Amino acid sequence: GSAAEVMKKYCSTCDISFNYVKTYLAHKQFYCKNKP
Ligand SMILES: [Zn+2]
Structure with missing residues (x-):
């Protein structure tokens, strides 16, 4: 099993x-x- 786990569509x-x-x-x- 590869520990990839993709999710480029959710701003935690x-x-x-x-x-x-x-x-x-x-x-x-x-x-x-996400201000500085
Ligand atoms: Zn955001």
Whole structure:
């Protein structure tokens, strides 16, 4: 068994998911609340 576990469509820090990858992109861009 490989310990891959993929999930590039869910911002754990925000606690949300996005079916569309484009959403996750635009999210981490300037939509995410991951302020410095
Ligand atoms: Zn986020």
